[PDB]
């Protein structure tokens, strides 16, 4: 048996309430046992860094400014789903504006 | 008195414990990525942690000082409530260092 390894764009749950969208690629994720992801939530505040996620349900706002490196392997990540490509690009475009990357 | 507000490129201590010294035994400093108006308004910043000892890991960016050299772990970018956690300024990174860090984050994402 092999544990789920998060891939770019994946929507995941981890231990340690809310889901997260994975920014970093499978290769990095699998190598490090870490990934860069942004948390999702229920409440939308019209905050400029929110990205609307079209799966509705529980966490349909991605908080693109809250990029976090997390230990997904140690925290038991599981896959909830995957964001649309356009949702992932929006998340990156908001980060891009933040970091200046 | 008003608090130190991290600015982009600052190297900061997070959760500064004045008992652990300037050594801050057990902690790591961080290079602040996000710009000042963002840090100031939100109480948050994106930063990447630093350590003194290079592990030869691919996303390490060398940080060159006078006395000691260190590394920024560019892949570890982290959003931090600096206002809640009491950031202090340890220094600032060369514009070239910031660029290298951003360039590395850009590959990982990639933006």
Swiss-Prot record, chain B:
GO terms under cellular component: protein-containing complex; toxin-antitoxin complex
Known EC number: 3.1.27.-
GO molecular function list: DNA binding; molecular function activator activity; protein homodimerization activity; protein-containing complex binding; RNA binding; RNA endonuclease activity
First-tier enzyme category under EC: hydrolase
Xref: Pfam families: PemK_toxin
Region of interest (Loop 1, participates in catalytic activity), residue spans: 16-27
ADP-ribosylarginine modified-residue sites: 3
Induction: Expressed in exponentially growing cells. Induction has been reported to occur after amino acid starvation in a ppGpp-independent fashion and to be Lon protease-dependent, but also to not occur after amino acid starvation and to be regulated by ppGpp. Also induced in M9 minimal medium and by chloramphenicol treatment. MazE alone and in combination with MazF, represses transcription of the mazE-mazF operon. Fis activates transcription. Part of the relA-mazE-mazF-mazG operon, there is also a second mazE-mazF specific promoter which is negatively autoregulated.
GO BP: defense response to virus; mRNA catabolic process; negative regulation of cell growth; positive regulation of programmed cell death; quorum sensing; regulation of DNA-templated transcription; regulation of growth; regulation of translation
Biotechnological and industrial applications of this entry: Can be used to produce large quantities of a single protein if the gene coding for the protein does not contain any ACA codons. Up to 90% of expressed bacterial cellular protein can be the target, which can be produced for up to 4 days. The system also works in eukaryotic cells.
Reported consequences of knocking out the gene: Decreased sensitivity to dramatic intracellular increases of ppGpp. Cells missing mazE-mazF survive high temperature, various DNA-damaging agents and H(2)O(2) exposure better than wild-type cells. Cells missing mazE-mazF produce more P1 phage than wild-type cells, while introduction of lysogens into a growing non-lysogenic disruption culture is lethal. Cells missing mazE-mazF show reduced biofilm formation, and survive antibiotic treatment in log phase better than wild-type cells. However lag phase cells disrupted only for mazF had a lower survival rate than wild-type cells.
Keywords: ADP-ribosylation, Antiviral defense, DNA-binding, Endonuclease, Hydrolase, Nuclease, Quorum sensing, Repressor, RNA-binding, Stress response, Toxin-antitoxin system, Transcription, Transcription regulation, Translation regulation
Region entry Loop 2, involved in substrate recognition, spans: 52-60
Annotated control of activity: (Microbial infection) RNA cleavage activity is reduced when ADP-ribosylated.
Post-translational modification: (Microbial infection) ADP-ribosylated by enterobacteria phage T4.
Protein family per UniProt: Belongs to the PemK/MazF family.
Domain notes: Loop 1 (residues 17-28) effects catalytic activity while recognition of the ACA cleavage site is influenced by loop 2 (residues 53-61). Alterations of loop 2 generate new cleavage sites in addition to retaining the original cleavage site.
Function, in words: Toxic component of a type II toxin-antitoxin (TA) system. A sequence-specific endoribonuclease it inhibits protein synthesis by cleaving mRNA and inducing bacterial stasis. It is stable, single-strand specific with mRNA cleavage independent of the ribosome, although translation enhances cleavage for some mRNAs. Cleavage occurs at the 5'-end of ACA sequences, yielding a 2',3'-cyclic phosphate and a free 5'-OH, although cleavage can also occur on the 3'-end of the first A. Might also serve to protect cells against bacteriophage; in the presence of MazE-MazF fewer P1 phages are produced than in a disrupted strain. For strain K38 most wild-type cells are killed but not by phage lysis; it was suggested that MazE-MazF causes P1 phage exclusion from the bacterial population. This phenomenon is strain dependent.
NCBIfam families to which the protein is assigned, alphabetical: PRK09907.1 (NF007386)
Subunit and partners: Probably a dimer. Forms a heterohexamer composed of alternating toxin and antitoxin homodimers MazF(2)-MazE(2)-MazF(2). The binding site of MazE and ssRNA or ssDNA are largely overlapping; the presence of only 1 MazE molecule inhibits mRNA endoribonuclease activity. Binds to EDF but not a mutated EDF (NNGNN).
Protein's recorded name: Endoribonuclease toxin MazF
Native source organism of the sequence: Escherichia coli (strain K12)
Lineage of the organism: Bacteria, Pseudomonadati, Pseudomonadota, Gammaproteobacteria, Enterobacterales
Gene responsible for this protein: mazF
